[PDB]
Amino acid sequence: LPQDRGFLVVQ
Amino acid sequence: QPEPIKVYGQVSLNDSHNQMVVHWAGEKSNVIVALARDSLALARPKSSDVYVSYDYGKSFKKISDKLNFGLGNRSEAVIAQFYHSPADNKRYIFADAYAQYLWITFDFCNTLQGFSIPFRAADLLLHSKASNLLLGFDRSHPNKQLWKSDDFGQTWIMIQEHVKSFSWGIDPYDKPNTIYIERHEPSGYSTVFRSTDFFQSRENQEVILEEVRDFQLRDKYMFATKVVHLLGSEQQSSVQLWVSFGRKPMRAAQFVTRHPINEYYIADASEDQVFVCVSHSNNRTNLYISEAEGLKFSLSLENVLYYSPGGAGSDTLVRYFANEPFADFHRVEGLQGVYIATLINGSMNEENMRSVITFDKGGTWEFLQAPAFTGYGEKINCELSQGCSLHLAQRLSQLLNLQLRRMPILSKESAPGLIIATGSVGKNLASKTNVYISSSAGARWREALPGPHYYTWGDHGGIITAIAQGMETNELKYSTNEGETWKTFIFSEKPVFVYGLLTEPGEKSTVFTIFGSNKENVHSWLILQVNATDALGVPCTENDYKLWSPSDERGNECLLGHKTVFKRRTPHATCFNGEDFDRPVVVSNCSCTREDYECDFGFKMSEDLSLEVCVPDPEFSGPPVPCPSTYRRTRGYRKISGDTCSGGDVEARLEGELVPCP
Ligand SMILES: *[C@@H]1O[C@H](CO)[C@@H](O)[C@H](O)[C@H]1NC(C)=O
Ligand SMILES: *[C@@H]1O[C@H](CO)[C@@H](O)[C@H](O)[C@H]1NC(C)=O
Ligand SMILES: *[C@@H]1O[C@H](CO)[C@@H](O)[C@H](O)[C@H]1NC(C)=O
Ligand SMILES: *[C@@H]1O[C@H](CO)[C@@H](O)[C@H](O)[C@H]1NC(C)=O
Ligand SMILES: *[C@@H]1O[C@H](CO)[C@@H](O)[C@H](O)[C@H]1NC(C)=O
């Protein structure tokens, strides 16, 4: 599962 | 079986930007806003797309094209960040990464209007009560200028130069329009100002503290670090922590210390009390706790796991992910005295970390009592007295092992008492990781699920969801009984890579949002929406509720002579509290105990530890003016700061003695 793609942040 | 979970929406974005920023507008708005942007880490971001939904994630509408330079600019817009209003959830502002240009909306993004502005919006800060009001900072400017807008970002005026940092004040402690700033000085350090008129008049500008390293604002408290040259230039500088409570002038706090203090970190500030991490120049960090409403810090726990770019952990992986110091220290949210910390024994790796917990705001600490039985049911052999306990991973522990997707301890005021954490049973944090759950605010745990998972809860804690980490999947594990049992739901036909599993902040819904990308192709964003009402099935009734306070776990002991009781649904009840559940909470004072009192100024504990009273201290030999009203003179015993104790015999006698005015 790729280490530097698909990162999520809530605001 | 009519499936107990519906897939209320499936959405492929056709977007492959590495990062997504999501905002629910809430207030039953039904609007969700997303920005797909390239990784922040690089300062060379190359493209962005913006999407908004109006049917609560059933379907997203791409609006990147509506962000343009008006009619007609072929230059292509690129968004760094977007900012929402705490005051008005309809309003939004998007900022171009390159162009000194902004976009605004008061209609949930239906209509966007472009404006150029006199600076680049590196950072904006929107007033939290006055929707129209906000500030904007241009870091990359040589003068580091600060601007205010009065009309939600159309027109600006530049109100200060050489700003290091800044913030609005806080209601109600500060006046309206109060702005704090650190301004740079020719010494390394900076001066702290407060202004009520946007730095227009000199008589409305106020110096808070001079020559500071950092400054921070937190409810009643303000903190700063000062480097003082006591011996002189030739001698050792002393690093000090300055503190204001209730906006009284800042004074330097007193620390009882073997060693030179190297830096301070404010770990938590609540109920008129402060947790500070004092780290020394030997890379050890201990944890102090403020007296209530006070500057009197005493040692609480030693060797807390801590990172600072200046200090400890600086020379490990963490530095590539954190540019600001922090600690593996957790406040169990919605509760007063409960915290979880990671201790460090040797050098920084799993083997040396153990978790400890407190229920008395750091008065005492224990290790975490491991669950008796595995998820499956078999006995777990673990004895506190053999140095075996439960240990929970936190961002730092995790960041060292480069595990960027793991879950920090989860706790929220939606579900007082409920903690879910990634962790391990053993001598330390270095074994297989599982998912552990407590609803006793940490007092007792269960092994909920074996592997690493993403987890979240909804319906005020009544339903929990989870997705196994590391490989592709289409299983959604869920539990309605605090993780005692689980059931799987297949959320899509072919398994997919999951990037996260969320609920609208507040955790009130039975809706969950899965983000991910499908397996076949390389990364492209994809969002599923999922309704789990039918897993709870029916509304709760008075029968499904029961009363609970943390006191109930630490043998009825109050905290600062008061305690909080919560109405919580029992663990076995299958029923739903409802989005509008308005959870009964009652705070009350409890009749007095010995632990509510301390020895008065110049009194002490007699040598006989066995039996403990206060006795006039010999070395102090030992009065209200003017008295006309009654004096109530000491018996040597004093209610401890902030303690709202009341009633009971121990109050009756142990309290101070009256003498009618001189
Ligand atoms: C219009 O296009 C130019 C590039 O030709 C760009 O620099 C500019 O930012 C756009 N509009 C404004 C107001 O800057
Ligand atoms: C503490 O950590 C730093 C890295 O920030 C390292 O260079 C140094 O050797 C350590 N200092 C001591 C006194 O152990
Ligand atoms: C720290 O280390 C010693 C041995 O190196 C060990 O016996 C002890 O259990 C550890 N102490 C704590 C508080 O973890
Ligand atoms: C979830 O499903 C139930 C019907 O089973 C419905 O009452 C509820 O409003 C749904 N919520 C949403 C946000 O679709
Ligand atoms: C407890 O005492 C405090 C201060 O002594 C008081 O303000 C508060 O009202 C009391 N608690 C309750 C539930 O009345």
What is the distance between the alpha carbons of residues B100 and B118, in angstroms, rounded to a whole number? 7
Element at B129 (helix H, strand E): none
Q: What angle do CA B516, B518, B521 make, to 5 degrees?
A: 130
Question: What is the secondary structure of B499-512 as a DSSP string?
Answer: EEEE--TT--SSEE
Closest residue CA from atom 4 of ligand 1 = B75
Integer Cα distance of B330 and B505 in angstroms: 19
Q: Tell which residue, B310, B218, B301, has the closest CA to residue B266.
A: B218
Distance (Å) from the C-alpha of residue B22 to the closest C-alpha of chain A? 5
CB B337 within 8 A of CB B361: yes
How far is C-alpha B161 from the chain's CA centre?
31
Cβ pair B306, B325 in contact under 8 A: yes
Classify each residue of B334-353 as buried b or exposed e, where b means 16 or more C-beta atoms within 10 Å of its C-beta. Answer: bbbbbbbbbbbeeebebebb
Cβ neighbours of residue B506 under 8 Å, at least 6 residues apart?
B26, B414
Question: Taking the CB of residue B432, how many other CB atoms lie within 10 A of it?
Answer: 10
Rounded to whole angstroms, the Cα distance separating B382 from B428 reads 12
CB < 8 Å to B19, chain A: 7-9
Name the nearest CA neighbour of B418 among B501, B335, B539: B335
Q: What pairs with residue B569 in β-bridges? A: B545
Report d(CA B506, CA B413) in Å as an integer. 8
Contacts 24+ apart (CB under 8 A), B195-204: B198/B148, B198/B157, B198/B159, B199/B159, B199/B160, B200/B159
Report the distance separating Cα B309 and Cα B362, nearest Å: 26
Experimental technique used to determine this entry: X-ray
Written as one string, the DSSP assignment of B222-254 is: EEEEEEE-SS-SSSPPEEEEEEEETTPPPEEPE
Residues of B in contact with A10 (CB under 8 A): 22-23, 502, 505
The span from the first CA to the last CA of chain A, in angstroms, equals 25
Nearest partner of B456 among B515, B544, B399, B368, judged by Cα: B515
φ, ψ dihedrals at B558, nearest 5°: -75, -175
Distances (CA, A) of B519 to A3, B473, B515: 15, 9, 13
Residue B314 CA, closest ligand 2 atom number: 5
- Within 8 A of B23 by CB-CB distance, chain A residues are 10-11
How far does A10 lie from chain B, in Å, by closest CA?
A: 5
Q: Give the Cα separation of B243 and B246 in Å (integer).
A: 10
CA distance B38 to B46: 7
Binding-site residues, ligand 4, Cβ < 6 A: B 8, 56, 511, 531, 533-534
What distance, in Å, lies between the first and last C-alpha atoms of chain B?
Answer: 83
Do strands A7-10 and B19-24 pair parallel, antiparallel, or not at all (unpaired)? parallel
Question: Rounded to 5 degrees, what are φ and ψ at B39?
Answer: -45, 140
Q: Which domains does chain B have, with CATH numbers?
A: 1-537 (no CATH), 538-590 (no CATH), 591-662 (3.30.60.270)
Tokens found for residue B509: 């819904």
CA-B56 nearest atom, ligand 4? 13
CB contact under 8 Å between A8 and B20, yes or no, is: yes
Distance B384 CA to ligand 3 centre (A): 14
Q: Which residue has the tokens 């018996």?
A: B635
| One-letter amino acid for residue B630 of the chain | T
Report angle CA B424, B355, B428 to the nearest 5 degrees. 50
